């Protein structure tokens, strides 16, 4: 049977159409799973009484992770995982931070799937502002490179793209 | 601006943001100059010949690398001059990603996701996990072990293999159990991959660094998925 | 109990001016999950619309505590987002309503996501009931 | 012009180029009107509910079809009027492929690759293989068994599943041992698949028919490769 | 390990870049194999003395296959497989008759690999010369459909493309 | 023993006229493998060239027994293929030689493949030794 063999992590990391391959079912399983892992961390904190390393006080270190995991704290100072705050953070880390979305933000040309079997590999040098800028990448504004992603074009901007073997 | 100072490889060490360091999980290893471009984030302008005991050989493997492409060259990233260029390049890319709302957010999340302190054998005690620290040498010979979340390091033998490594623990799977762990990214701002369109283009290196930073985010929050968890998608046949 | 109540719906002739309002309630817009430390670098109130038989598309959004706004490239010169200093209402205005606009409008709000991120992804935790807009001859 | 006559589904049979027929390898089956558009090539404007004993059900399987898409409809290709449209459509596509040097060549090769006569139990005797013939009914009730190379037939349950079928022998693998065998192509000139570009396009149906004719060429010359002989290609990972 | 799983037949049938995935080694194995199969057929003919079916004479039927397989015939009337004539026919059937080449000949837009996971499926009707012609396909000459494959464009030529579900 | 011998090589100035010849030998052009029944629907003699540092690209070809020809869209108005009735020689002519042409030219021949198929695939069983062409100022 022909087709492709893709990984969950890689697929999630890339986002875009690729991500639709993952069925609604495998999605919930993964979510609930990591949900439980966080609860386990909340439980480990609620139980902490001392601390080694010499870093700081159990007070500080506990606040640090309360922040890392967006934990809810009650009257007793006991931490708990908030479903909604969890979904948002999970969502944020797996659906929002994706290669595809970053592409929409850089306005550049890019592959449409994490998979690639091309043998084209180039040497470059982005340091010089004449070749690559923080805001325009290779496609320098108010330049011929400006539109049509000519800056990303191997032929048209052959100066910034020494091909290898 | 994400990276305040402007580092220059040749700058003299101070044991704070420019220093030689050692990684606990490497055992015997020569110290390597590093740069702290931001809180919890360091940069080692060297060829990664130590994260993995089986590296150090900047040479082609026995037979062949089971991939479409692979580039090798042992003189890459060896001259202080090149190293400085590497540092400048990673710096710009960071600034580039930072320059966007999405990149600012991700970078906040990364700096915010310190690896959990479950390194203790006893449940009512918090303890750092050695894999999540580095030893920063002081100008006098001391060394202060520091907690970090991310390290950008040069590529190994295969110059074009980019990856988000991580020192695993003994028992538990830190990148999958919620704890998270210091992420090391093998990467090079001096190379990029091309792709076809209606048209021969090149991937913007910042997008690649993004991809890796994204993996890192998952890992720092221990929510990554086993890289071996693949499944299959059939074509429409004819 | 978060709530979004769109309004200003009805119908108009090509060229007429339409004003839409959305009463938000239940959102503290105090820097979302991150915390008060983010009061100013987070949050978004905006508008989306769905053309009968077409995809839900983004229009514009403004910041809950700042003046930051973002419009779909396609519409900076045909719409204008506004907000009441209180940060409890959002307004979408437009004059010279074309027929290209005829559709259902929805207001959205996200505690911790910039108006730009809200527009490009797009993304939003809370949606409004939806208000129908239709132009004529 | 590849197809001389211009057939019209309702045309009365003559037992030469328009006739009801039966396929030996189907056993009990109602005869089905067919059309001989060219030497060694016939067209059956019917839903393929007989090449495979497990067909006939123009309905969706028990659970789900393990593919991206699949269309079902049991009233498709049921009215003489539709059938005539089908016939006209396959005819044009053939003319289309014929209209090129490459298509003329392929079509020559197909008409030229008659399935080998190794149907005999004794080595010094040539004998036709039943799977490579069809029974053509004469206006009087006779029937003459005829040798053919290719049959275009309508789709089965899954209207959009195009395929190059073939009645296998008992022992030997005709499409892989050099002998070759009558090829049947499930196909429909009334549907096509789309694909993305910079842009929502549609595949030209002639190119699909080409694909199938190409498979057929391989098979008629017994040089096809086991469809299960797949291998793997790794990505460049990152 | 991520990637794709492709079939030899399908890959060969499509041609184009896809075909390069097959390494020089698997290519020779397949060739020699089928070479031998033909020799076997040549051997079966050289040995034929009688014939069933009532079709024609062993003379005719033998000439038919001499032609099908491009067999060389000597003084004794014994058939043999010619290496060169074989390579050309093998080449012809597996490298020349490909979907990709047919595309170069129809001047149409088409996928670049036999693999496809799209769910877009349309209903059409090529019979009417106003919709589709033998020489222009959907892209009718001296028409707006003429260039940019507008005729194959689902949006621009929405009349000839009823979408399904 | 099939043989192809290109010639006409050397150098010229932009605008000068170049004539190339190729002596074929060993090909019966009698309808290739299919047989005499194909004498008229098969065979091709043409030209290919390789620009220093570029791919081998097709130029033009003519039929060995007919007048059929085919040119790379890019060159019908800058080149012209010819053949000697004998069917033992092929000629590529061109006037006003540009520098765009500077390259190595090769003649090809295929017993059973139309000149068009020879050009589009591209394909050819027999190649010539190759003759270098270079223009100046
Ligand atoms: Zn196929
Ligand atoms: Zn990755």
UniProtKB/Swiss-Prot annotation, chains A, E:
UniProt free text on domains: Has protease activity.
This chain belongs to the protein called Botulinum neurotoxin A light chain
Which domain of life, per UniProt? Bacteria
**Chain residues that bind Zn(2+):** 10
User: Organism, per UniProt?
Assistant: Clostridium botulinum (strain Hall / ATCC 3502 / NCTC 13319 / Type A)
**Localization (cell):** Secreted; Host cytoplasm, Host cytosol
Q: What does this protein do?
A: Has proteolytic activity. In vitro the whole toxin is reduced to release LC. After translocation into the eukaryotic host cytosol, LC hydrolyzes the 197-Gln-|-Arg-198 bond in SNAP25, blocking neurotransmitter release.
């Amino acid at each position: 049977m022909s087709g492709l063999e893709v990984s969950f992590e890689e697929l999630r990391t890339f986002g875009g159409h690729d991500a639709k391959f993952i069925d609604s079912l495998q999605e919930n399983e993964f979510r609930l799973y990591y949900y439980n892992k966080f609860k386990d961390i909340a439980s480990t904190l609620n139980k902490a009484k001392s601390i080694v390393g010499t870093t700081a006080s159990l007070q500080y270190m506990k606040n640090v992770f309360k922040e890392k995991y967006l934990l809810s704290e009650d009257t007793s100072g006991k931490f708990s995982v908030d479903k909604l705050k969890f979904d948002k953070l999970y969502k944020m880390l797996t659906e929002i931070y994706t290669e595809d979305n970053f592409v929409k933000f850089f306005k550049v040309l890019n592959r449409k799937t994490y998979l690639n079997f091309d043998k084209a590999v180039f040497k470059i040098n982005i340091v010089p502002k004449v070749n690559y800028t923080i805001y325009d990448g290779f496609n320098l504004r108010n330049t011929n490179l400006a539109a049509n992603f000519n800056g990303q074009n191997t032929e048209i901007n052959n100066m910034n793209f020494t091909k290898l073997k | 601006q994400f990276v305040n100072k402007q580092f220059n490889y040749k700058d003299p060490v101070n044991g704070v943001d420019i220093a030689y360091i050692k990684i606990p999980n490497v055992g015997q290893m020569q110290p390597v100059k590093a740069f702290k471009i931001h809180n919890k984030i360091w940069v080692i302008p060297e060829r990664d010949t130590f994260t993995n005991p089986e590296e150090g050989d900047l040479n082609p493997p026995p037979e062949a690398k089971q991939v479409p492409v692979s580039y090798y060259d042992s003189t890459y990233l060896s001259t202080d001059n090149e190293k400085d260029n590497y540092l400048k390049g990673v710096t710009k890319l960071f600034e580039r990603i930072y320059s966007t709302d999405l990149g600012r957010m991700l970078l906040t999340s990364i700096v915010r996701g310190i690896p959990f302190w479950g390194g203790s054998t006893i449940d009512t005690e918090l303890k750092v996990i050695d894999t999540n620290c580095i030893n920063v040498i002081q100008p006098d010979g001391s060394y202060r072990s520091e907690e970090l979340n991310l390290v950008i390091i040069g590529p190994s033998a295969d110059i074009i293999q980019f990856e988000c490594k991580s020192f695993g623990h003994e028992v538990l799977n830190l990148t999958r159990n919620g704890y998270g762990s210091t992420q090391y990214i093998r990467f090079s701002p001096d190379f990029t991959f091309g792709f076809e369109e209606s048209g021969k283009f090149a991937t913007d290196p910042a997008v690649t660094l993004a991809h890796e930073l994204i993996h890192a985010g998952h890992r720092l929050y221990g929510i990554a998925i086993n890289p071996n968890r693949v499944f299959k998608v059939n074509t429409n046949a004819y | 109990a978060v709530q979004l109540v769109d309004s200003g719906g009805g119908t108009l002739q090509a060229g007429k001016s339409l004003r839409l309002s959305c009463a938000i309630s239940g959102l503290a817009f105090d820097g979302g999950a991150m915390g008060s430390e983010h009061r100013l670098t987070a949050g978004a109130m905006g508008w989306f619309r769905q053309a009968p038989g077409k995809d839900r598309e983004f229009v514009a959004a403004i910041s809950p505590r700042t003046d930051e706004t973002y419009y779909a490239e396609s519409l900076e010169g045909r719409f204008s987002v506004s907000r009441d200093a209180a940060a409890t209402m959002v307004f979408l205005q437009a004059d010279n309503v074309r027929l290209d606009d005829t559709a259902s409008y929805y207001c959205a709000a996200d505690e911790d996501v910039t108006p730009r991120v809200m527009g490009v992804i797009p993304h939003a935790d809370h949606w409004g009931q939806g208000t129908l807009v239709t132009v004529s001859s």
